[PDB]
């Protein structure tokens, strides 16, 4: 009589199945072509 | 029980934007060229004969 077999209480996985870890970005924007401003 | 898979910690760390910079031997200012010439002995007399 006490509850008719809750099927996985509709689902177990809580926080598991959420954000896992911060990203590192496609690439921290690659600096342009720097170097020598040859002159003088 | 089964507290929604009771809380798990977030992901700290990674204390750096993946730039991995660092410059090798960079440029140096050109040495203002010493214009080629020729030492000599300009005087007043060249062939008094």
């Amino acid at each position: 009589p006490g509850s008719q077999g809750a099927p996985g209480l509709q689902g177990a996985p809580g926080a598991p199945g959420s954000q896992g870890a911060p990203g590192l970005q496609g690439a921290p924007g690659a600096p342009g072509s720097q170097g020598a401003p040859g002159l003088q | 029980g089964a507290p929604g898979a009771p809380g798990s910690q977030g992901a700290p760390g990674l204390q750096g934007a993946p730039g991995a910079p660092g410059s090798q031997g960079a440029p140096g200012l050109q040495g203002a060229p010493g214009a080629p010439g020729s030492q000599g002995a300009p005087g007043l007399q060249g062939a008094p004969g």
Side-chain angles (χ1 to χ4, degrees), chain B:
Chain B
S8 86
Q9 285 54 14
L14 181 82
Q15 289 67 351
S23 183
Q24 74 280 15
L29 298 173
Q30 70 85 20
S38 52
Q39 265 190 8
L44 210 58
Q45 187 57 69

Side-chain angles (χ1 to χ4, degrees), chain A residues 9 12, chain B residues 1-6:
Chain A
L9 259 62

